[PDB]
Amino acid sequence: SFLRRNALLLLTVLAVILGVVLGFLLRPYPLSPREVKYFAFPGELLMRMLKMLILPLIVSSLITGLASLDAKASGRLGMRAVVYYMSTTIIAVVLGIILVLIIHPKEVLDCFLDLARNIFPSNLVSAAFRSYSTTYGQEVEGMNILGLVVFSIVFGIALGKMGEQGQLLVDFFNSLNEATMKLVAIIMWYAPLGILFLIAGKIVEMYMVTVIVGLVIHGLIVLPLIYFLITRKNPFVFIAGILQALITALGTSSSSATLPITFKCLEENNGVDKRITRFVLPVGATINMDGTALYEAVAAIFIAQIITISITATAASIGAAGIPQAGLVTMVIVLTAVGLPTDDITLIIAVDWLLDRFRTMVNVLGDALGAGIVEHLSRKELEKQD
Amino acid sequence: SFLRRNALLLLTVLAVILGVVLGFLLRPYPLSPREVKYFAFPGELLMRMLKMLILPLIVSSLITGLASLDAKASGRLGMRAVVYYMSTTIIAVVLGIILVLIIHPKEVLDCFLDLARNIFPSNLVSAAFRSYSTTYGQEVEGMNILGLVVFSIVFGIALGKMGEQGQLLVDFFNSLNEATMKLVAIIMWYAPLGILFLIAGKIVEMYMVTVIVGLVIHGLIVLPLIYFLITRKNPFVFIAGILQALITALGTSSSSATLPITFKCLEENNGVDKRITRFVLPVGATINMDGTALYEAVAAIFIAQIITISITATAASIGAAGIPQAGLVTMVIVLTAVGLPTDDITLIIAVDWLLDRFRTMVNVLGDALGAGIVEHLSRKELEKQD
Amino acid sequence: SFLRRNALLLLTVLAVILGVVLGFLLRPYPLSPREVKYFAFPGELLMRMLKMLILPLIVSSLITGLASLDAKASGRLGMRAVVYYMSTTIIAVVLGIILVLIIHPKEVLDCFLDLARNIFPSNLVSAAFRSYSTTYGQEVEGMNILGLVVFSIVFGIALGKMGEQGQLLVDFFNSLNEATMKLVAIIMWYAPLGILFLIAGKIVEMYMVTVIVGLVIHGLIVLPLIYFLITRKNPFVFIAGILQALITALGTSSSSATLPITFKCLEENNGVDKRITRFVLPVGATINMDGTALYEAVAAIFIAQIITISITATAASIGAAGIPQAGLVTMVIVLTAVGLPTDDITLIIAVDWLLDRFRTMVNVLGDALGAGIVEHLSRKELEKQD
Ligand SMILES: COc1ccc([C@@H]2C(C#N)=C(N)OC3=C2C(=O)C[C@@H](c2cccc4ccccc24)C3)cc1
Ligand SMILES: COc1ccc([C@@H]2C(C#N)=C(N)OC3=C2C(=O)C[C@@H](c2cccc4ccccc24)C3)cc1
Ligand SMILES: COc1ccc([C@@H]2C(C#N)=C(N)OC3=C2C(=O)C[C@@H](c2cccc4ccccc24)C3)cc1
Ligand SMILES: [Ba+2]
Ligand SMILES: [Ba+2]
Numbered sequence A, B, C: 001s002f003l004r005r006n007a008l009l010l011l012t013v014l015a016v017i018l019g020v021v022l023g024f025l026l027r028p029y030p031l032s033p034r035e036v037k038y039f040a041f042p043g044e045l046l047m048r049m050l051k052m053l054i055l056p057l058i059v060s061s062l063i064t065g066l067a068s069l070d071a072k073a074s075g076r077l078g079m080r081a082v083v084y085y086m087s088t089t090i091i092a093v094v095l096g097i098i099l100v101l102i103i104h105p106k107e108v109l110d111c112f113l114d115l116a117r118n119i120f121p122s123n124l125v126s127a128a129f130r131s132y133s134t135t136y137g138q139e140v141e142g143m144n145i146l147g148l149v150v151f152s153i154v155f156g157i158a159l160g161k162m163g164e165q166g167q168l169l170v171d172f173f174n175s176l177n178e179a180t181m182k183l184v185a186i187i188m189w190y191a192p193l194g195i196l197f198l199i200a201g202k203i204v205e206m207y208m209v210t211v212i213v214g215l216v217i218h219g220l221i222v223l224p225l226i227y228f229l230i231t232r233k234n235p236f237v238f239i240a241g242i243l244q245a246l247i248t249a250l251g252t253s254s255s256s257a258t259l260p261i262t263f264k265c266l267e268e269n270n271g272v273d274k275r276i277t278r279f280v281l282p283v284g285a286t287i288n289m290d291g292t293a294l295y296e297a298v299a300a301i302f303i304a305q306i307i308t309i310s311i312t313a314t315a316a317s318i319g320a321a322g323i324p325q326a327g328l329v330t331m332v333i334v335l336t337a338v339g340l341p342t343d344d345i346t347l348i349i350a351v352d353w354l355l356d357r358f359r360t361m362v363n364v365l366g367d368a369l370g371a372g373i374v375e376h377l378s379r380k381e382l383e384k385q386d
């Protein structure tokens, strides 16, 4: 009965172990890294299929998400969601400093300007695939999620204040979100074939231990106890539904790439209201620092062998939303403010390929558990609409 | 009562004087021009917020603008609008020659080919952010307004001939125009904070006098007397409404960047019919040469110290719609036809930063006063639809 | 009466002869090839006008084409269409080997990977104008038709399974297809002026004979006899309607560029059902190899003076959908698998300018005659919907 009910998640569990085993079976690499790319190809296709659906999901989710909700109420439960994104990050930043205290193993100012320049895009067509970042054309390949999310929020809320006239395109983007979420059903089945070929190509190439210690204790103790404190419901039962999304989080290593799956794992598996998931999930894929700030704060102290380092590490990953090799460049810029050499970066690249997979896993769990706290803390607002 | 009724325009007047004063207070610049960019940043954000809204306003304005109007009648009042864009330019070109007579202070052929190549875009997605211009990829960053306006006009009129089937997406773009015009309400409030920081960063760096003499006499005598001749109504009362747009025209220095504000200053402040503003304003932001041809014709004679120079100067700025540093490159190409050195251009760049602000001010007033003449000369066509 | 009924096709026939005559009248070229570009300009404008309409036609045709049809039935008549695209190619590849037997006159593996990478686009906005192809950014200018067609098919069929919710945007893209097909009426009239100036600029610059022999025998014997075998109707009567599209196929030399005209020549001239033309024509503009594989297979044997060469030549042109100079680069990659020098390519470029015009003519006829066979072999499926 277990193999019949939960069939696809047992396949992804089989894909993780088979991906490690087959990868370790073909570990002595006599072939050039060019041939490794040809081997990791079936997993590379899944990423293209997922990246395809990021843009028409993020745009359509928020536009309907802020329109379905009253402009006055949505602005209030939105501030309630900010409470989660700020508190969990504060505890994580604090946890990172204690973690290195017991077990010790482009300009800086320009990144705060590029983040503000990315928030308000110059062209929405250019925002859909090019992100702004000052270089010495500043626009470079990689979706400007921070700009599209900002426009979608103010555009979506403008439709809530429109009513009669606005009703047309709101029904359009809801049908569009339903269309893009009907394409995700097929992408979920290609995931086992993808993941096993994707992680196998990435394996064939004490700080590492420090990171996982803090990441697991935050995702299994800190975050679930925050959920149990307000909702008064078991967190593992909520975790059981989002299992098909948390396993893919390791393979994808991007919260944006897993967003189409994470959406179905909350709306279908756990049974969470669409009106709040469409409001929490897109913002959470960029604003949430729970896992990525906890990874970057530990990275700064390890190579050095306090308030200024934390703020710079936060504004780094928010500025580099879904751009390829985001963690690689952001760690360089954060070292200019502290005054540390860039020679140590040549070693963390050969260890980030497995550590970034767990970084996303905490980030995806945070947005999912965040929506669970939001739903319970906004039940009266949701009943007002019905 | 005056401070209560007209509050935001008194703030922009305060922003202009405070922008000059604070700029002159911090005039001795010990900092590198890189730091000037960081200072002019709050005004740089307003430009990104305005450029954001250009594209979804221009596309949606014309599509509904030509569909709401009868395909037979719209084609006729359109020719009536061409009468304005041709006559005012002829008088301006003539005024420029008299102005230099009393007070004397890529190829040419390729620009006429690039203009024709820009009119019909090869790809509408590429047209939304890349303009065609031959270089020795010809497509370069900067919206192809000339191509999007052309498509929107023939696409919008195709919906007027569609009727029943076409009614769906016409109601979509009208709701979309209403959405983009509901976002402009917040951008209008960021303008005082923007303008004061934007003009201050631009101040810290007899021909100049000749230009303003011709520009003021055209905008305060020539254009208002043309309005008073047909409408038989006071032009200053019409100018009083568009005050919030004319002040921003100095700061933005682009007729396209001020189009979202100019739209509200005509539809809300002066109380002009949407059906004709959506028809006159987008075309006027590119086709109108009243101020920019009057600036370029005087530029040619001053550095030289007749029919061929005027036509080449007209087709230059129409070809370079909203592309950055349009006046800088177009003045180089116009000198090849007359046979004059490019050494004189190194001096006008340090004076254009204040002169281009008044160039746009005449251009924005021309499109606004043009719509006023169009409304009065097409009252019977508008009554036919009701 | 003949000049009155069929007026525009007699003009395009006049354009072909006048284009050759005027071109041969101005054959001794004393002007640099830069001036030839300025001469071929009125035909260059038609191509921009046609390329403009490719993207909003391909996207809107398939989305409504798979939604109007039942998800179960469409998947079946789709397999019936694959029968045509596979059988006609098999006969063509076989015909090419017999044609060279009687009358004898980036990596290879990467192209099979790039084709799979193009099928699933990473970003739909980027897919609308940039195609993926590995180079040693892989994304380069030229519409990713293979990616947009794939998305449109799975997105369109997702709307058929949506019903009530999906009904909104399906009526949108059908009105949009009707809009883009109402713009094509004016482009059809610019074609005679275009073609005569476009072919004249291309003329002023035994293998050639071998190609036309096989191309004419396939398009006038093989393909029409396949039509007459199933439909039991005269093929020349069906060819008579699509005459306005077949003449333009010579001028455009691209099946995608002629798609907007080919659509009207089937829906209006021959009177074919929209539901199947919108399903056959976009796929046929890329997947069909009837003419282009017959051109490339003969190209390999001529320069050499069997199963491995045919498969590589097929996957080459499908990978290079509508990208400029597709036949030039694909012939280089196919020679690496066989092991032949690239010195022979410097001669075929000066002969492809007339041979590629007939290559498309066979490809356009194949898609048109394919739709004719599909309609007759799916009459019962079409009656089920009514
Ligand atoms: C800096 O990064 C952000 C931007 C937004 C948010 C919140 C959020 C989430 N999650 C969503 N979906 O909507 C709103 C939020 C508000 O705080 C306020 C709320 C809102 C209401 C009314 C007018 C607004 C005008 C501008 C911005 C937000 C507005 C909408 C959080 C972080
Ligand atoms: C060269 O730059 C331009 C293009 C257009 C215009 C006029 C205009 C303004 N303002 C608008 N909104 O629509 C039309 C205009 C016509 O003259 C004619 C009118 C029109 C009616 C019917 C069919 C047409 C077909 C092609 C072009 C315009 C057409 C529309 C002016 C300058
Ligand atoms: C490789 O290049 C292609 C892709 C598609 C096609 C066929 C086609 C044509 N012509 C169209 N318009 O739709 C479908 C086709 C199917 O074979 C199958 C059919 C279909 C039905 C149901 C689910 C599908 C899921 C994925 C792909 C096709 C699907 C749609 C042919 C070649
Ligand atoms: Ba957080
Ligand atoms: Ba509402």
Ligand SMILES: [Ba+2]
Pocket: B084, B085, B086, B088, B089, B287, B288, B289, B290
């Ligand atoms: Ba004018």
Ligand SMILES: [Ba+2]
Pocket: B067, B068, B159, B160, B161, B163
């Ligand atoms: Ba109408």
Ligand SMILES: [Ba+2]
Pocket: C084, C085, C086, C088, C089, C287, C288, C289, C290
């Ligand atoms: Ba075929």
Ligand SMILES: [Ba+2]
Pocket: C067, C068, C159, C160, C161, C163
């Ligand atoms: Ba249906």
Ligand SMILES: [Rb+]
Pocket: A253, A254, A255, A326, A356, A360
């Ligand atoms: Rb990541």
Ligand SMILES: [Rb+]
Pocket: B253, B254, B255, B326, B356, B360
């Ligand atoms: Rb300007």
Ligand SMILES: [Rb+]
Pocket: C253, C254, C255, C326, C356, C360
């Ligand atoms: Rb071709």
